Design a protein around this ligand. Structure first.
Ligand code: MYR
Ligand code: MYR
Ligand code: MYR
Lengths: 108, 108, 108
C-alpha cells in the first residue's frame, strides 16, 4: 500500500525530477527534505509547515528579510522551500531557478 | 538564612504551585526556569531578563512575531516566560492557560 | 610577499592597535576576527560581509534590534563589528568605545 504515497505524477515523483541547477544533472532527493526539516528546527520554526503550500509560504515570509545578509546555508534553505512551495502548488518548475522565478513573480 | 528566598507566598512558592496544563497534575519546577534560561542563551537573549516583570515583557515582545511559525520548543519557551511574567506581576494564575489569557488581555 | 597584507598603517596593523576597553591594556587580535566569523555563521549570516564597510554596516543593521535584549555574546559581536566597520572606513578610533561613538554618530 506504500505505493499510494509515491504515485506517478504525485508530489514526491515531481520533487525527484526537479534539478538543483538550472542546467544541471543532479536532482532533488529525500535527503534535501530531511535537511530542510532539520534546518527549520535549528531556526525554531515548525518543520510541519513544509507539508503545505500555506506553510511553505509563511516560512518563506519569515526568511525573506534574512536573505540579503544570509549565509549559504540560509540561501539554500530558502531555495529548497521555494521548490517545495511550487510542488505543493502543482506548478511545473524544472529547476530551482524556475521556482525562484515563480515565487517572486507571485509576490507581485 | 536560605529560607528567605523560599518564603511562603513568595515567587518560588507560587511558581511551584502553578500547573503546566489547565486541568493537569504536574506543576512548574526549578528545571523549567533552568531550561528557559538555556533557551534564551541559544537565542542570544540575556537570560537575566527572566528576573523581572519588565525583562519578561521585553522577551515576550521579541518572541511574539515568531510564535505563529514557531516550533514546539519556541511555543513552550513563550508559555513559560508568560507564567514567569505573571508571577513577577503577582497575578494569581493557576495554570499556563490563565497566564496566556492574562498576557494577551494586558496587550489590549 | 605575505608582508603586503600586513602593511604598516594598513587594516590589520590598525586592528591590532585598537584597545578592547576605553582605558585598557589588551588589544584586538586575529582571534577576535575568527570568533566574529564563527558567530555570524551561527546566526546564519554570511561571514564574508566582515570584509567591507558596506557588509559591516548591513550586519550592524541586522543586529541592532536585538541589542537591547541581547546576551553578552550578542553585544560583544556587535561591538567587534563596529570596530571592524571603523577600520574599513579608515576612521582612527583608539578603542571599542570610540567605535561605538562613531557608529551611532554616523546614524544621525
Ligand atoms: C503496497 O502498495 C504494497 C506494495 C509492495 C511495496 C513494495 C515496496 C518495498 C520497498 C522496499 C524498501 C526500500 C528500501 C530502499
Ligand atoms: C537559614 O534560613 C538557615 C536555615 C536552615 C536551612 C536548611 C536548608 C537545607 C537544604 C538542604 C539542601 C537541599 C538538597 C535537596
Ligand atoms: C614576502 O613578503 C616574503 C617575505 C618573507 C615572509 C616572512 C613571514 C614568515 C611568517 C612565519 C609564520 C608565522 C608563524 C607565527
Amino acid at each position: 500500500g506504500a505505493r499510494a504515497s509515491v504515485l506517478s505524477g504525485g508530489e514526491l515523483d515531481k520533487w525527484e525530477k526537479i534539478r538543483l541547477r538550472p542546467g544541471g544533472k543532479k536532482q532533488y532527493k529525500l535527503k534535501h527534505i530531511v535537511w530542510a526539516s532539520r534546518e527549520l528546527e535549528r531556526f525554531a520554526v515548525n518543520p510541519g509547515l513544509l507539508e503545505t503550500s500555506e506553510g511553505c509560504r509563511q516560512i518563506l515570509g519569515q526568511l525573506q528579510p534574512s536573505l540579503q545578509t544570509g549565509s549559504e546555508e540560509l540561501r539554500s534553505l530558502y531555495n529548497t522551500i521555494a521548490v517545495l512551495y511550487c510542488v505543493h502548488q502543482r506548478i511545473d518548475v524544472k529547476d530551482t531557478k524556475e521556482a525562484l522565478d515563480k515565487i517572486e513573480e507571485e509576490q507581485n
